[PDB]
Design a protein around this motif. Sequence first.
Motif, PDB file in Angstrom:
ATOM      1  N   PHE A   1       7.907  -9.492 -34.526  1.00  0.00           N
ATOM      2  CA  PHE A   1       8.372 -10.664 -35.260  1.00  0.00           C
ATOM      3  C   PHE A   1       7.445 -10.947 -36.443  1.00  0.00           C
TER       4      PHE A   1
ATOM      5  N   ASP B   1      10.778 -10.656 -28.137  1.00  0.00           N
ATOM      6  CA  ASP B   1       9.560  -9.875 -28.356  1.00  0.00           C
ATOM      7  C   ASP B   1       9.581  -8.550 -27.586  1.00  0.00           C
TER       8      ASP B   1
ATOM      9  N   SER C   1       4.349 -21.001 -34.514  1.00  0.00           N
ATOM     10  CA  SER C   1       5.017 -19.722 -34.273  1.00  0.00           C
ATOM     11  C   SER C   1       6.129 -19.410 -35.289  1.00  0.00           C
TER      12      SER C   1
ATOM     13  N   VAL D   1      14.889 -16.526 -36.890  1.00  0.00           N
ATOM     14  CA  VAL D   1      14.490 -17.821 -36.334  1.00  0.00           C
ATOM     15  C   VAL D   1      15.648 -18.441 -35.536  1.00  0.00           C
TER      16      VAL D   1
ATOM     17  N   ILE E   1      12.653 -16.341 -26.551  1.00  0.00           N
ATOM     18  CA  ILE E   1      11.632 -15.810 -27.456  1.00  0.00           C
ATOM     19  C   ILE E   1      10.900 -14.634 -26.815  1.00  0.00           C
TER      20      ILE E   1
ATOM     21  N   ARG F   1       9.185 -19.659 -34.671  1.00  0.00           N
ATOM     22  CA  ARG F   1      10.285 -19.045 -33.928  1.00  0.00           C
ATOM     23  C   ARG F   1      11.526 -19.925 -33.841  1.00  0.00           C
ATOM     24  N   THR F   2      11.351 -21.217 -34.140  1.00  0.00           N
ATOM     25  CA  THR F   2      12.313 -22.265 -33.865  1.00  0.00           C
ATOM     26  C   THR F   2      12.314 -23.261 -35.037  1.00  0.00           C
TER      27      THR F   2
END
Lengths: 225, 226, 226, 63, 67, 66
Positions: free
Chosen positions: B221, B211, B111, B31, B207, B113-114
């Motif tokens: 991910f 991927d 997501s 992350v 991001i 991701r963050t």
Amino acid sequence: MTPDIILQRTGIDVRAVEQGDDAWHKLRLGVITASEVHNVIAKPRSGKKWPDMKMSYFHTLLAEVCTGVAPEVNAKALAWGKQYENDARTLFEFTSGVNVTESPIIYRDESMRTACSPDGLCSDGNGLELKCPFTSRDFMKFRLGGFEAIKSAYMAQVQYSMWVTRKNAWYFANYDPRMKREGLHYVVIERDEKYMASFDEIVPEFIEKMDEALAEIGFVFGEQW
Amino acid sequence: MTPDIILQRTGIDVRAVEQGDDAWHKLRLGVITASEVHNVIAKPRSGKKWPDMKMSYFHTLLAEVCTGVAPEVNAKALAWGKQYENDARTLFEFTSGVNVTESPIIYRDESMRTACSPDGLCSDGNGLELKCPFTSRDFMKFRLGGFEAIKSAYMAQVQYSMWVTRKNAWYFANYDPRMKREGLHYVVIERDEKYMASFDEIVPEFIEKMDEALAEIGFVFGEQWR
Amino acid sequence: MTPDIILQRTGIDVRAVEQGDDAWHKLRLGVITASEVHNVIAKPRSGKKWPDMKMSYFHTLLAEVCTGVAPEVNAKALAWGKQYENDARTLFEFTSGVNVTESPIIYRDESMRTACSPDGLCSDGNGLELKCPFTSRDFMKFRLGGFEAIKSAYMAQVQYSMWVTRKNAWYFANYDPRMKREGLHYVVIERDEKYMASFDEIVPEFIEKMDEALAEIGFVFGEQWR
Amino acid sequence: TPVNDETMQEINTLLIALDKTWDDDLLPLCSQIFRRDIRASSELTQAEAVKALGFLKQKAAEQ
Amino acid sequence: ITPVNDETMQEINTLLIALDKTWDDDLLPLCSQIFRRDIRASSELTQAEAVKALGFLKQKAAEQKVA
Amino acid sequence: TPVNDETMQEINTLLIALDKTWDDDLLPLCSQIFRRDIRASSELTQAEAVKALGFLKQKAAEQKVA
């Protein structure tokens, strides 16, 4: 500065100090020492702005006043230096023919803002700096002599010691017990008036700025004792 | 984003997660975190080629996905930080007069991701970032310069924390238990829209590229969490 | 060059010594090795001054001769490498299909000033360099490939190994036991005649300068083995 | 080296102004941050009390 | 602790057959080395271990283009 | 591995040129720096003796003895 005046302002007897002692460290807190002064005299790429290493020492020294401690950087190197220092001193005496007295810290003036801690005081008037480089690499660099054998930080250190003590020359010896031969080598470094003038100019300004920063957070130099 | 999506994807109950535990580390794997985002927004001296620190973080973060582990970096500074973080939170509560509530991780969206892990959420709607600098030297720098002597890495961390949580300001406090006086200092950092725009542009590109790299080696991910 | 000439010169039977060994270090004292030669071939951005990394290696190597010891750098990384090297070799064999026999140190010539220690010698004529990078970060850098996957220090090590052994190609492999899949990756690197020419010009000069420095303080190369 | 009286009074002066107490506020604070069970005000070192005082002063300054 | 599922076991068996390799002669010895454990049967593998083993077979097979 | 004749000889010549002795000067020095009670020159290894000799040569050079 006399031994009673130091005791009078710090409560510590210089006669009873052993380099590495709690008292030895306390006496150097917030003081511009020779090992660090290369940071004080760093000038920038151009213009009037203080480089990072100068700002970093400034903040370090300020923190000493306000915490009353100095963390030790490079614990391996320091333990190595302490292990072999007296062997280096003894071998310097032996090979040079010059006798060495150990000295407590020497303050330049009554302000106690500037000091050095000579690794020796010599019978011919000269001071003594001793290094036991943690790497034989660095020993070799010094040992081979020539251009850039003595790093500028150490030249600053040696010259500052002469500024502080008023002295005219200083011995600079390295020792490495791992060398099968040629393990003790020294040079004589002469007082350089270009360095003396640089200290005369830059060091008072550095002390003044420290006083301003300390005042801003309600501290005054001396408190640490 | 809610406790439910985190449970479905990672198996973990966020309400049971207190800062530093096994679970907390797991949820941050792969992350983009506030402490590290300064690497994501690094730009080169000229052009569009990623600077070394950016590539280095890309590689670090991709490795977290594919190994499911993260090594410790600055063990001593980190242990010091863990040693004194609670005292810093307490002293900030006491001196500021604003109650702090601890928060587990906050993801910016579904997501995951963050994310950021605030050192606290304040009764006045600001976040709280807490540093116990390993050197008193670094404490002294902050104490004197204030806003002027906050590292850009730290400024990025605070701004990204506002980008993630949508908040308008963040308390930035340093604590040093070695200081005889003046050992607790804090400032209020305001949300800066230039930073908000940088993150809006740069982070989704980061991001996307992650991927692609993961796909190049047969990874996706989420694998870190199962 | 044989183990009888190494024995006569150093008292060490090369056949009873295995990578990591106490005697393995003695055989390398003062010798320009493949992992360090990147220091020897570094040029200055302009002029003719040896860069810091070159002078630094110059002084290190001379100290090895004069002290008879070489301190260990990056202890944790070396232990990780030792822990995983045989698995890395077996996995390389298994996945590539090529057989690998282990090799002691290989000196380029009777002078013993130059050597490499291949992590293996392959059935197809190529050598083998094996890395178990301490950080999965560096594993990922390499695994992703591209112009820049191989650090220039590593290219110099590989090319130097071919220079020392007269070989035309070398396997460069990374293993990371923490990767869930794709933990072993390799490429073939061909002999690069530009590197060969740089070694031919720069290495003998570096040797001459080392000898002059040793002589300056009354040492002779080879002393560290008497 | 134990807490002196003039420093103890500066602390108590602020405790009263802040409407805080040793039992409810300052002893628990000090016990946490100095990692020690501090049962009474006289058990503070001077250095410890100088830190506590600084924090009370900061708390007061912010109102 | 989580064991090798049947799906993964099948993919491993498929690759062993195509590479002309066996559990007892090739893969179990390999798995014993790299996981630092005495592994005498396919069922002694974890799923994570089996995934690794499957990956190494896929790499081996892919060099040769095997089916 | 004990001190060879050659090395002993150069040491002994330099001690005399320098007006120093084994018992008063050199063995105390060697005891300090090699961290051992060295009571006689026979208790010294060749490696130790080579280092000792080096120090004596430096001492002789800086003195400018005959």
